[PDB]
Amino acid sequence: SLDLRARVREELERLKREGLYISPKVLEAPQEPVTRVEGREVVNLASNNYLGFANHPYLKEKARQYLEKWGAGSGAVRTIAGTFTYHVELEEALARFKGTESALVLQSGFTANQGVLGALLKEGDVVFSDELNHASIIDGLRLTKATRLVFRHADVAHLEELLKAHDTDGLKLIVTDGVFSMDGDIAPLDKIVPLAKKYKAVVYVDDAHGSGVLGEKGKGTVHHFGFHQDPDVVQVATLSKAWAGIGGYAAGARELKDLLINKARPFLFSTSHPPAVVGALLGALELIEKEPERVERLWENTRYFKRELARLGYDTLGSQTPITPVLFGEAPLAFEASRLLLEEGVFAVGIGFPTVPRGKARIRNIVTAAHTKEMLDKALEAYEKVGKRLGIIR
Amino acid sequence: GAMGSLDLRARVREELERLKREGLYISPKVLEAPQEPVTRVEGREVVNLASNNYLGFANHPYLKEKARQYLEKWGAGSGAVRTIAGTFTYHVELEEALARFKGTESALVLQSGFTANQGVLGALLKEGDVVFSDELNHASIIDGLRLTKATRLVFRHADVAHLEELLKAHDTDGLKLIVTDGVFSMDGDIAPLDKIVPLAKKYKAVVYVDDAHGSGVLGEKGKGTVHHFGFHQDPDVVQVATLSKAWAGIGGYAAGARELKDLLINKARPFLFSTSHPPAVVGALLGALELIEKEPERVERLWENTRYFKRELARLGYDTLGSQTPITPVLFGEAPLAFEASRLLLEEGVFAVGIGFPTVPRGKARIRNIVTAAHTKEMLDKALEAYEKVGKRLGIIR
Ligand SMILES: *Cc1c(COP(=O)(O)O)cnc(C)c1O
Ligand SMILES: *Cc1c(COP(=O)(O)O)cnc(C)c1O
Fold first, then answer.
1. Looking at beta carbons, which residues of chain B come within 8 Å of A88?
2. Which terms does the UniProt entry file under GO BP (chain B)?
3. Of the CATH numbers 1.10.3720.10, 1.10.10.60, 3.40.640.10, 3.40.50.150, which one belongs to the domain with range B61-290?
4. CATH number given to A57-290
5. How far is CA A387 from CA A313, A350, A364, A365, in A?
6. What is the residue with the minimal CA distance to atom 1 of ligand 1?
7. d(Cα B328, Cα A186) in Å, to the nearest integer?
8. Nearest-CB residue to A73 (from B48, B248, B266)
9. HSE-up of residue A385 (Cα within 13 Å, Cβ side)
10. Which residues of A are catalytic?
11. Which is the closest atom of ligand 2 to the Cα of A206?
């Protein structure tokens, strides 16, 4: 039998041979549109901080008030002694904001997917999953006894063919990202939801990258498509991206929240979030109502950055959200491009196969409300210099 | 079916009516004051023995101030996963402080104890590996294992005779992993690592310890069960534990050999696909580690309180199920009597929650009490007075 170091080496030297081994960088200043990496100031386009909330004094003061009042830790799972007044306050504020009958907060978007898919799905159920769904959705589904089918990315012709072919006396669940993390495209819920109604299916939307981004005042992708009051639409999304904390929520029908409280394994077995995290998120919800112009500025910045990259000759892959991939083609060129950007004071991560297709390696950039014109123009200047040098633009 | 596939409210009702029939429907209490040995439930001050707050850290000013400093310096959110733009100086500060405290070469912090088990078991295990799992392992270990392609065997609880029988019968060219709670979450007994680890060496196996209830509780200064048994430098012993219980925050850690940390950074799915913890959480936990070094007598007081409380429950005629740690179950037998006993304790000013099947065996329903360093003699005696009154009234003690 192998020992631990022997198994570690076999896995690590595999990744190193594969060109898959990661050496993460340590950020040396707060999560902001300008930050410090390897001792140098950089324009940061790598983070999920869409509304510039992650170091906003308003969230930090509401966090500080809840910290001082309630303490450092909840000290139990929600179902034993870890539900406090402040957890209830945040679920009421979220449901109000989402426009859904109910909201439940869980330990992360990652565990929310396990909890909600696990609670909802039984043996004999059929799941129809978009090809390009977030990894956390796959782990949720693997823990269920449901039949798992995959439809080609955003392909409602294929989805329909599968719904047609796979009837059940149980539940049909159509499972999609709201906004896909890599290409920044929006799930076609305008076609998926009606298809759901034809073949009696429930729609499950993991809106990590749509929450605080799409819809009126950032109420999300489901709100954007107008389906937030539909009891047969279930929404899950992280509180770690636009909302700039940690946690994930489940929102929809009244009855869903009671089922999750009683069945969701991460809710039953993992400690509830502490006062400072809940304080910050109550802050984030109050701040986005006080400053709806933040969402405006996120989209203005996004449109400016995509338009200027198109002018230089770059392909941003039809991205529809602040997720702005810049195509470099092959993995090595994307990684070299990222290295050269950092030399220019711009921090944005190269992504290639297996995370994205062969021939579709990109640098992933996420535009935020807190980026200034000078910051975006510095990124553009760097992309111009690096693009010319690597012969992807002229 | 004539009417089609089920709608969401139909599946919810069907599941909730089932749970209500099975006696599995839960209406959690809402706590109206901080996590302390005395808190407020339903408008009334109560002796709280329901929480995991072993060292009384959850509302300690020292953790709150170190959390405050990190919050002010760094902000409300990390805003990315560790592998992209979510590792900050403070995450590495906490990992270095944890490895130093644990006496392991390395430590890595993950989103929870629950997901830590998925990340570490998932990173380590491949198709053709053999896992030997204790019968009474935590739900989070089961979910970690289910996500792996490893062959899964179960040994009768703490039964090193049966474990050896299985090791003898189930060989692999890959990895043998013996997986156990360090401290069992429900019956509060200690994994026999003094016997498991030597057995692991005989059959060339790695030992995996989920020490959620041992971290900050067993060993010198609460360094944990693996430290208590003296195996903290062993590269073939892996530890995972929550930072949510004794350490009174959120998160989980993985500790052991240098190489383990680099494999988790590259392979652990919760690490790759979930946002890192924010400054307030990391601040509080750096604070917790400084406070237990300033006040290691907290562990002594936790154990004095534990021994007192166990002895007095035995005196009344209650069965605490051979519990060894501050986890002090009181056996009621059936789930309904545990639930009723919990209701009657609340009437007496005492908050402790009943637990029955499926989380514990049928006929082994109990109230879980967790004694802490911050419980006073008067609080424990008030709990005992309540257990006496409720016990006599339900005809379980005489
Ligand atoms: C509490 C506990 C966990 C879960 O830890 P969280 O950080 O609350 O997710 C895992 N394993 C065991 C043994 C536990 O007791
Ligand atoms: C980021 C993300 C998650 C994970 O959310 P965490 O709160 O970071 O665990 C899940 N699903 C999708 C689609 C995401 O983009």
1. 30
2. biotin biosynthetic process
3. 3.40.640.10
4. 3.40.640.10
5. 9, 14, 15, 15
6. B212
7. 52
8. B248
9. 15
10. 181, 209, 241
11. 13
